[PDB]
Short mmCIF file of C-alpha atoms in Angstrom, two decimals:
data_model
loop_
_atom_site.label_atom_id
_atom_site.label_comp_id
_atom_site.label_asym_id
_atom_site.label_seq_id
_atom_site.Cartn_x
_atom_site.Cartn_y
_atom_site.Cartn_z
CA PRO A 466 103.84 47.79 156.93
CA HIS A 467 106.68 45.47 156.07
CA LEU A 468 105.08 42.70 154.02
CA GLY A 469 106.23 39.08 154.10
CA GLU A 470 107.00 36.66 156.90
CA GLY A 471 106.13 38.41 160.14
CA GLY A 472 104.33 41.08 158.15
CA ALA A 473 104.72 43.87 160.70
CA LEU A 474 106.41 47.27 160.61
CA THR A 475 108.11 48.17 163.90
CA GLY A 476 111.08 50.52 163.47
CA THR A 477 113.44 48.28 165.42
CA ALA A 478 112.15 44.98 164.03
CA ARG A 479 111.82 46.25 160.46
CA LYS A 480 115.42 47.48 160.65
CA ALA A 481 116.53 44.10 161.98
CA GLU A 482 114.55 42.16 159.36
CA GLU A 483 115.72 44.35 156.47
CA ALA A 484 119.35 44.04 157.58
CA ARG A 485 118.92 40.28 158.05
CA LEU A 486 117.38 39.73 154.61
CA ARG A 487 120.15 41.85 153.07
CA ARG A 488 122.92 39.96 154.87
CA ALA A 489 121.26 36.63 154.01
CA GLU A 490 121.18 37.48 150.31
CA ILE A 491 124.85 38.47 150.61
CA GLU A 492 125.66 35.09 152.17
CA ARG A 493 123.66 33.30 149.47
CA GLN A 494 125.57 35.16 146.75
CA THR A 495 128.91 34.29 148.37
CA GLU A 496 127.95 30.62 148.67
CA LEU A 497 126.84 30.44 145.04
CA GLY A 498 129.91 32.24 143.71
CA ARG A 499 132.43 30.11 145.57
CA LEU A 500 130.49 26.93 144.73
CA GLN A 501 130.75 27.91 141.06
CA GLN A 502 134.49 28.48 141.55
CA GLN A 503 134.77 24.98 143.01
CA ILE A 504 132.74 23.55 140.12
CA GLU A 505 135.11 25.21 137.65
CA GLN A 506 138.16 23.78 139.40
CA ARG A 507 136.63 20.29 139.53
CA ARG A 508 135.97 20.63 135.80
CA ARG A 509 139.62 21.58 135.34
CA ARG A 510 140.68 18.46 137.26
CA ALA A 511 138.40 16.34 135.06
CA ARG A 512 139.68 17.82 131.79
CA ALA A 513 143.23 17.22 133.00
CA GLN A 514 142.49 13.59 133.85
CA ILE A 515 140.91 13.00 130.43
CA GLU A 516 144.01 14.55 128.86
CA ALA A 517 146.17 12.18 130.92
CA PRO B 466 189.25 -2.58 101.92
CA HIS B 467 186.12 -1.63 103.83
CA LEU B 468 188.07 -0.77 106.97
CA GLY B 469 186.03 -1.19 110.14
CA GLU B 470 184.25 -3.93 112.03
CA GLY B 471 184.31 -7.06 109.89
CA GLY B 472 187.69 -6.37 108.30
CA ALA B 473 187.55 -5.83 104.54
CA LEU B 474 184.82 -8.01 102.98
CA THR B 475 185.52 -6.54 99.52
CA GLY B 476 182.77 -7.85 97.25
CA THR B 477 179.25 -9.15 97.72
CA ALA B 478 180.12 -9.02 101.42
CA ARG B 479 180.97 -5.34 100.96
CA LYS B 480 177.56 -4.70 99.41
CA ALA B 481 175.80 -6.75 102.10
CA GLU B 482 177.43 -5.17 105.14
CA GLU B 483 177.37 -1.61 103.78
CA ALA B 484 173.66 -1.86 102.99
CA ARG B 485 173.09 -3.55 106.36
CA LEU B 486 174.77 -0.66 108.17
CA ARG B 487 172.75 1.88 106.18
CA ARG B 488 169.49 0.06 106.96
CA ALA B 489 170.57 -0.18 110.61
CA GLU B 490 171.20 3.57 110.71
CA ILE B 491 167.66 3.99 109.36
CA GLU B 492 166.45 1.64 112.10
CA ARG B 493 168.31 3.59 114.79
CA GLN B 494 166.76 6.82 113.51
CA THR B 495 163.23 5.40 113.57
CA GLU B 496 163.74 3.90 117.03
CA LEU B 497 165.13 7.10 118.56
CA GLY B 498 162.32 9.18 117.06
CA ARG B 499 159.68 6.82 118.41
CA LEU B 500 161.40 6.91 121.81
CA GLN B 501 161.27 10.71 121.83
CA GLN B 502 157.56 10.60 120.99
CA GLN B 503 156.83 8.10 123.76
CA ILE B 504 158.76 10.17 126.31
CA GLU B 505 156.95 13.36 125.30
CA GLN B 506 153.52 11.75 125.58
CA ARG B 507 154.39 10.30 128.99
CA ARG B 508 155.41 13.83 130.00
CA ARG B 509 152.02 15.07 128.80
CA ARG B 510 150.30 12.49 131.00
CA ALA B 511 152.44 13.53 133.98
CA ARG B 512 151.63 17.21 133.48
CA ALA B 513 147.91 16.48 133.19
CA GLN B 514 147.76 14.35 136.34
CA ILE B 515 149.72 17.03 138.23
CA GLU B 516 147.18 19.61 137.07
CA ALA B 517 144.41 17.32 138.32
#
């Protein structure tokens, strides 16, 4: 069986849950990466203001 | 005669005005250099705020 929340193996539902967990981790990775990009650019703004 | 502004002077006046003009050239040099430095640092501030 698929173990975790729901905890049931059913071809259709296991496929859906696996795909959903995969896509959700993808979305989490995208969020984290672009948030780190934004943090870097805010740091750049701050360094520039201190230089000013 | 010391031809130029002031006429001729010729004497202690010659010494005085010649040394005054030399010291004033020194003063002009110092002032223009300090002005260049101020302008460059203001430009640095402008660049940094634009980067921000």
